[PDB]
C-alpha cells in the first residue's frame, strides 16, 4: 500500500519543486517522509472526531490537525 505512490508521481512532485535529476532511493525517501507526515496529521485528526463521539473525520478535523502541525490549509473550510 506504500508503493501506491508511484515513481513518476514523485518525479512530478520534484518537478513541481524544480528538481532536474531526481535520484533513486529518493523515491523511498519521499514515501518515508509521507509516512511521517500523514501519520502526524491523522493522529490528531481522529483525536478531534473522537471527542464528539463520531466515526468520520470531516474536512474541519483535517484543518484543525494541520493547524496543530503548523500549516493552515485554506480551501476546505466548511
Amino acid at each position: 500500500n506504500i508503493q501506491g505512490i508511484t515513481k513518476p508521481a514523485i518525479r512530478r512532485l520534484a518537478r513541481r519543486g524544480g528538481v532536474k535529476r531526481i535520484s533513486g532511493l529518493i523515491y523511498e525517501e519521499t514515501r518515508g517522509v509521507l509516512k511521517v507526515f500523514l501519520e502526524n496529521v491523522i493522529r490528531d485528526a481522529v483525536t478531534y472526531t473522537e471527542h464528539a463521539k463520531r466515526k468520520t473525520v470531516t474536512a474541519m478535523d483535517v484543518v484543525y490537525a494541520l493547524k496543530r502541525q503548523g500549516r493552515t490549509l485554506y480551501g476546505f473550510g466548511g
Binding site: 501506491g4 508511484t6 524544480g18 517522509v33 473525520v57 490549509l73
Partner: protein
C-alpha cells in the same frame, strides 16, 4: 524535456498524486490510531490531506534543491531531504 517539463507542472494547478492510492494509504494509517476498526473518511477530508501533503512535499523539495546547488550538485540526494528536516524544527 529538461527545459520543458519544469515549466509545465508549475503553470498547472491540479493534483499530482493519485486520489485512490493516497486514500488507501490514509486509511491504512487511520486504522493504526483507531485501535483496529474500520473508519469513514469524507471526500473533502481526503482531498484536504492530499492538498496538504502535495504542497508539503513540493515545499520540502524546493527547500532541498537549494541545498543541492550548495554542494555544487544538480543531482538531488536524500542528504538534502534530511537536512531540510533539521533546520525546520
Amino acid at each position: 524535456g529538461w527545459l520543458k517539463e519544469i515549466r509545465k507542472l508549475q503553470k498547472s494547478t491540479h493534483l499530482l498524486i493519485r486520489k485512490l492510492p493516497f486514500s488507501r494509504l490514509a486509511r491504512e494509517i487511520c486504522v493504526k490510531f483507531t485501535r483496529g476498526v474500520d473508519f469513514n473518511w469524507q471526500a473533502q477530508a481526503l482531498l484536504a490531506l492530499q492538498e496538504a501533503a502535495e504542497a508539503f512535499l513540493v515545499h520540502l523539495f524546493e527547500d532541498a534543491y537549494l541545498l543541492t546547488l550548495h554542494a555544487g550538485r544538480v543531482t538531488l540526494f536524500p542528504k538534502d531531504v534530511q537536512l531540510a528536516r533539521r533546520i525546520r524544527g
